[PDB]
Design a protein around this nucleic acid. Structure first.
Lengths: 137, 106, 189, 197, 172
RNA sequence: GGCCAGCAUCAGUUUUGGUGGCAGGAUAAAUCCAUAGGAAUGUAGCUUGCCUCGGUAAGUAUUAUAGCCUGUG
RNA sequence: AGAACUGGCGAUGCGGGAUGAACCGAACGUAGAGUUAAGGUGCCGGAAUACACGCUCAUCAGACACCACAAAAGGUGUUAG
RNA sequence: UUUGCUCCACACAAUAUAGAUGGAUACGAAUAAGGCGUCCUUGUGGCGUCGCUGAACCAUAGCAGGCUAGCGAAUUGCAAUGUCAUUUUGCGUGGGGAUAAAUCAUUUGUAUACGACUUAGA
C-alpha cells in the first residue's frame, strides 16, 4: 500500500549468541556470550577467549553489547570457542568506540607522574595550533 | 603557578555517636572522592588540620590550627574517624578540614 | 505472570497513511485526518510492512496486556472513520408533548437546542463538537442523524443529547420520553 | 565540589530529592533548587490532593494563626519536606537551612549557570513505568497557588532565549570541530593519543 | 536457611542382640549445612518410623553435586505445606540450572506468594522433566519455544557520584 | 639536666590487606577428551505447489554443509 | 478479684521498644582501646537510597512482639494451587 | 558661622567569619526514546554516528610564582598557618558633591480609656 512512517525503538535484545560485557563480580570487564535463556532475569553465559567460566548469571550484572554471532542454543565450551573465532568477535569489538573508551579510561588511570607531566607540555602544543587553525574572529 | 594544594579537603560531619548520645573524642571526617572502606584504607594515619581564623593575634598569626590524625574507617562509604588533640568544637559540623599526606607509604 | 511477548496487528487499508513518532498516531486518508496521543501507554509500534502495522509489548502483566488490545481497537476505529466515517442515527420518542430540535449558531458555535421537551419552558443547550456535522433526516419527521469522521466526537455528542433530554421526579418506565440513539453506521455504507 | 549547586528539579520525586538535599545541606553545601513547579510525587492526583486536604484540616482550634501554616507554593511544599528532614529547632539546623534557596521557575541569577540533576531521585529511574505520578505544579495550583500561569509565562520568555544561546554555541562547535580535524594528523596528536589523550 | 546444599543421609536404628542388622534408611535432604541436614533426617524419619535420635544412629552423610550444572532443566517440584488454616499439596515448576538452585527458588517463591516459611514446607519429589510435553505450567512454557529473543526496554544506570550533569537516557 | 612534638626500633592488645604451602570430598563435581546409543524447540541433504539452488509452507532424513542429550572409560 | 511454679519491679541505673516501675539486651569503681547484644542502617540519626526472588496501587494503603485492637461475611481486584 | 554630611581615589588601623584555594563549564523536550553530523523534494523525512558515566572538558612549566633587551633560586638546618583571599566600621590624604526634616509643646474632632489616629499653625 502507501507510505507508512514508524519510529519507535531499535533495541539490543537478549537472544542466543549475543555478546555481553560482564560488569560486576569475578569476571569483571571481560566479554561473554549468552548460550541459553533461563528466564527474564537470569541467563547462561560462556566466553572462552575472554577466559570466563560457563556461569548462570542474572542480567543485573551484565551489559548487552550491540553485536551478535550465530550459535545454536545450549552449545558447549568447545563449541562457543570455535564460533568465537569463526565469526571473529574480539576484533569486531576493538573496532567499536565503546571498547576504545574502556581502554582509554584504563590507560589514563595507569599513567605515572612523568607522563602526567608529559601530557600537559604536549597539550600546550595542541592548544597552540587550534588558536592558529581557528585564527580568526 | 596557581597550583598549590597538597591536601584533600574533607568535611567534618559529626562526633562519633549513637542515637541520643554522642562521644566528642572521635569525629567523623568525610574525605572527598572516597566511596568505599577499601581506598579509605589509604588515608589511615594521614593527619588532618582544622584551620580557622581568630581575632587576637598569637605568635604573629591570626590563623590557628588544630592537628590530629585519621584512625580507622567508618561504615561502608569512606567515612573515616579521627582523634584530634583538642577535640573539634562542634560548631564545625559541616566545616572543611584538610587531610594531608604527611606520613606517606606510597 | 508477566507474559514475555504480546503482539497485535493493525491492518492498514488502501490509500491510508499512518504517521507515528513517540506514541502519537497521525492518520490521514481519503477523507479526514485524525491525531490521537498515546503517551500514557507503554507500547511499541513497528512498521513491518506498508499494509499492516505490528503493535507489541514486552514483559507486561495482565493489566498491561489487557491495555494492548485496547490500543489496536483505538487505531482501528481511527482508520475506519477515515476510510468510511461514522454516522449515528438518533430518534425522538415522546408521549404527548412534541420535541422541537433546531440548530443555532450563537457567539461561540453551533449550539443544539431542544424546546417543548415534556412541555418544558427551558431550552436545553448542547454544543456540537467540531468535525461532526449535524444532519436531519428530511423524510422521517422525528429523526436526527449525527455524522463525522471520528467515532468519539460523534458518540459523545450523541450521548450528550441523551443526557440532556432526561426526565425528573417521575417514573422513567411510564415517562419514556427522550431522544435515543438507534443506529451506529458508517458514512459510505 | 562546586560552591553553589543549582538543581534542575524537573521530574524529581519530592521526598527522594528532599532527602539527598537535607543530607547534603547539613554537610555545608549551598544548594539552590530551581524550577520546583515541575517536581513530581508518586501516587495518583486525587490521592495526593486528599493527602493535602488532610493537612489543611490540621490547624489550631483556639487561634488558627498559631497552628501549622499551609504554604501553597511548590517551592514551599518542597521546603516543608526538607524542613522535616533537618533538626530545624536548633542552631545546626537553622544554619543548615540558611544554605538553601528554592524557587519555582529559573530566576535571572540562575538562568546562565549550569543545572545538575540528582540521579537517585529522578522519576524515570525510580518509578516503575505505568504508575500514576503527580506534577507538583498542578497539585499546588489546585490548593490555592495563584502564580502558575505567571511562572509558565516567564519560563517561555526564557526558553526562547536559552534556545537562542544554544544555537550560537552549536554553530561555535561546528566551526571548531570542522577546524580541529586539520590539527589531528600531527605528531603530537600521535604522541598524545597513546597517553589516553 | 542459607545457600542450600543437597545432602544424602543414611540412618539406622541402634542394634540389639535380637536384631543386630536393622535396615538402613536413605533421604535426599536440602539443607544449609551438615548439622541442619542431620536434624532434618530425624524429622522426616521420626514422622515415618518408630525411631528417634536417642534410639538410632546416622550411618553416613555425604554431599551430592550435580553431573550437569551447566545445563538448564525444567524441574518439577512436588511440595506440601501448612497454610494458616489447613495443609495442602502443590506442584510447581522451576527452570534453574542446578537442583539446589531450584529449591532456593522454590522457598522464595512460596514465602512470597503464600507466606509459607521454611518451618512449614515439606518437599516431596524434585525431578528433571525429560521431554517438552510433561511441562504443564504456562510460566515455563514460554521459555521453551524456538527463537526466544526478547528485549530489555527500561535500563537504569546505577550512580556512584550523587549529582549528574546530563539527563540520563534509558535506551538499551 | 625539663616539658612538648616527629621518626626509627621493640613490646602489649587489636584492626585491615597481599601472598605461599598443604589436606579432604564421587581422591570435588564440571569443562575437556574417548566411545556407544538416543531424541527434538530438526542441521544438512532429499520430496512437494509458491519460489530468491528449497525460502518462507511441511513431509521424510537422527550429523551430514550446525549441533544437543544420556550412559561408560 | 483469687491461688500454684519461677523470673522481675519494689530497692536499679544502662543500650533498645519515640515516650513508660515491670517487656527485649544486660545488671554499674574511675578511664583508654578493641568486639558485640537487643535494636537498627532514605533524612532527622551513628550505620548499605546494599544485594537476591516475589507479592502489593489502597477516594481511611501498609510498616518495630508486650502495645495501644478488630470480626463473621464477602469481591470474574490480582497472583498462586 | 567651611567643625557637619555625601561619593570616589591608598596610607591605614581595626573588627567578623555556619567556614574561597584552579574553573558554579547555561538548550529544550522525550525515556516503549534522543543528541550530533550530513545532504535532500524540508518532514512525526532519508543517511551516518554516539551513549553504557563528569575518572569529562577547560586550565596548569617559574621565589606563594623571576628576568639581561641566557643570569638571580641555598644555612626557612628533617615536619610544626608557614600565611596572604573577604564582609564591614572609624581616621588621615584630595577629587568631587548636596544645603533637610521629624517629634514634644499649642490646636482640630472624621478619632479617642491612655497611647494611637486625623487636622491646622512662622
Amino acid at each position: 500500500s502507501t507510505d507508512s512512517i514508524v519510529k519507535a525503538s531499535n533495541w539490543r535484545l537478549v537472544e542466543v549468541g549475543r555478546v555481553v560485557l560482564i560488569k560486576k563480580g569475578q569476571s569483571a570487564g571481560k566479554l561473554a556470550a549468552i548460550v541459553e535463556i533461563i528466564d527474564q532475569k537470569k541467563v547462561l553465559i560462556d566466553g572462552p577467549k575472554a577466559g570466563v567460566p560457563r556461569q548462570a548469571i542474572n542480567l543485573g550484572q551484565v551489559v548487552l553489547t550491540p553485536l551478535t554471532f550465530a550459535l545454536p542454543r545450549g552449545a558447549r565450551t568447545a563449541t562457543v570457542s570455535k564460533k568465537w573465532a569463526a565469526a571473529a568477535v574480539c576484533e569486531k569489538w576493538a573496532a567499536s568506540s565503546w571498547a576504545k573508551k574502556i581502554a582509554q579510561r584504563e590507560r589514563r588511570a595507569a599513567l605515572t607522574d612523568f607522563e602526567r607531566f608529559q601530557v600537559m607540555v604536549l597539550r600546550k602544543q595542541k592548544r597552540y595550533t587550534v588558536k592558529k587553525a581557528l585564527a580568526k574572529a | 603557578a596557581e597550583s598549590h594544594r597538597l591536601y584533600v579537603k574533607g568535611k567534618h560531619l559529626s562526633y562519633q555517636r549513637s542515637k541520643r548520645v554522642n562521644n566528642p573524642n572521635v569525629s567523623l571526617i568525610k574525605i572527598e572522592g572516597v566511596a568505599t572502606p577499601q581506598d579509605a584504607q589509604f588515608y589511615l594515619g594521614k593527619r588532618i588540620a582544622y584551620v580557622y581564623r581568630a581575632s587576637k593575634e598569637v605568635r604573629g598569626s591570626k590563623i590557628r590550627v588544630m592537628w590530629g590524625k585519621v584512625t580507622r574507617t567508618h561504615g561502608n562509604s569512606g567515612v573515616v574517624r579521627a582523634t584530634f588533640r583538642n577535640n573539634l568544637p562542634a560548631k564545625t559540623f559541616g566545616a572543611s578540614v584538610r587531610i594531608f599526606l604527611y606520613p606517606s607509604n606510597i | 505472570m508477566k507474559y514475555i511477548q504480546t503482539e497485535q496487528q493493525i491492518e492498514v487499508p488502501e490509500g491510508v497513511t499512518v504517521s507515528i513518532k513517540s506514541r502519537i498516531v497521525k492518520v490521514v486518508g481519503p477523507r479526514g485526518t485524525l491525531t490521537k496521543n498515546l503517551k500514557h501507554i507503554d507500547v511499541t509500534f513497528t512498521k513491518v510492512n506498508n499494509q499492516l502495522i505490528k503493535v507489541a509489548v514486552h514483559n507486561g502483566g495482565r493489566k498491561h496486556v489487557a491495555a494492548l488490545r485496547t490500543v489496536k481497537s483505538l487505531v482501528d476505529n481511527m482508520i475506519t472513520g477515515v476510510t468510511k466515517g461514522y454516522k449515528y442515527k438518533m430518534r425522538y420518542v415522546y408521549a404527548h408533548f412534541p420535541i422541537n430540535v433546531n440548530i443555532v449558531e450563537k457567539d461561540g458555535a453551533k449550539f443544539i437546542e431542544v424546546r417543548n421537551f415534556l412541555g418544558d419552558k427551558k431550552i436545553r443547550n448542547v454544543p456540537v463538537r467540531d468535525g461532526v456535522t449535524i444532519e436531519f433526516s428530511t423524510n422521517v419527521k422525528d429523526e436526527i442523524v449525527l455524522s463525522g469522521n471520528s467515532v468519539e466526537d460523534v458518540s459523545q455528542n450523541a450521548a450528550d443529547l441523551q443526557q440532556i433530554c432526561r426526565v425528573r421526579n417521575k417514573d422513567i418506565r411510564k415517562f419514556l420520553d427522550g431522544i435515543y440513539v438507534s443506529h451506529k453506521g458508517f458514512i459510505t455504507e | 565540589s562546586q560552591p553553589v549547586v543549582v538543581i534542575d528539579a524537573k521530574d524529581h520525586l519530592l521526598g527522594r530529592l528532599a532527602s539527598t538535599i537535607a543530607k547534603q545541606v547539613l554537610n555545608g553545601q549551598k544548594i539552590v533548587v530551581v524550577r520546583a513547579e515541575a517536581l513530581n510525587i508518586s501516587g495518583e492526583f486525587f490521592r495526593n490532593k486528599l493527602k493535602y486536604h488532610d493537612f489543611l484540616r490540621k490547624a489550631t482550634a483556639f487561634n488558627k494563626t498559631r497552628g501549622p501554616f499551609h504554604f501553597r507554593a511548590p517551592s514551599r511544599i518542597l521546603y516543608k519536606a526538607i524542613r522535616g528532614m533537618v533538626s530545624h529547632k536548633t542552631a545546626r539546623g537553622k544554619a543548615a537551612l540558611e544554605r538553601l534557596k528554592i524557587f519555582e521557575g529559573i530566576p535571572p541569577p540562575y538562568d546562565k549557570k549550569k543545572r545538575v540533576v540528582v540521579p537517585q531521585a529522578l522519576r524515570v529511574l525510580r518509578l516503575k513505568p505505568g504508575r500514576k505520578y503527580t506534577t507538583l505544579g498542578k497539585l499546588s495550583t489546585s490548593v490555592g497557588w495563584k502564580y502558575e500561569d505567571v511562572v509558565a509565562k516567564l519560563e517561555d520568555k526564557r526558553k526562547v532565549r536559552s534556545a537562542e544561546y544554544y544555537a550560537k554555541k552549536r554553530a561555535f562547535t561546528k566551526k571548531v570541530s570542522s577546524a580541529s580535524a586539520a590539527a589531528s594528523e600531527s605528531d603530537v596528536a600521535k604522541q598524545l593519543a597513546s597517553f589516553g589523550y | 536457611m542459607a545457600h542450600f546444599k543437597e545432602y544424602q543421609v543414611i540412618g539406622r536404628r541402634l542394634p540389639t542382640e535380637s536384631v543386630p542388622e536393622p535396615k538402613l534408611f536413605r533421604m535426599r535432604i536440602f539443607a544449609s549445612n551438615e548439622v541442619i541436614a542431620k536434624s532434618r533426617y530425624w524429622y522426616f524419619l521420626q514422622k515415618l518410623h518408630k525411631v528417634k535420635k536417642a534410639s538410632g544412629e546416622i550411618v553416613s552423610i555425604n554431599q551430592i553435586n550435580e553431573a550437569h550444572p551447566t545445563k538448564v532443566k525444567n524441574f518439577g517440584v512436588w511440595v506440601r505445606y501448612d497454610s494458616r488454616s489447613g495443609t495442602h499439596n502443590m506442584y510447581k515448576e522451576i527452570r534453574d540450572v542446578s537442583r539446589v538452585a531450584a529449591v532456593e527458588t522454590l522457598y522464595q517463591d512460596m514465602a512470597a506468594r503464600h507466606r509459607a516459611r521454611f518451618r512449614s514446607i515439606h518437599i516431596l519429589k524434585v525431578a528433571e522433566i525429560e521431554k517438552t510435553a510433561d511441562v504443564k505450567r504456562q510460566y515455563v512454557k514460554q521459555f521453551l519455544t524456538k527463537d526466544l529473543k526478547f528485549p530489555l526496554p527500561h535500563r537504569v544506570q546505577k550512580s556512584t557520584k550523587t549529582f549528574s550533569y546530563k539527563r540520563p537516557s534509558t535506551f538499551y
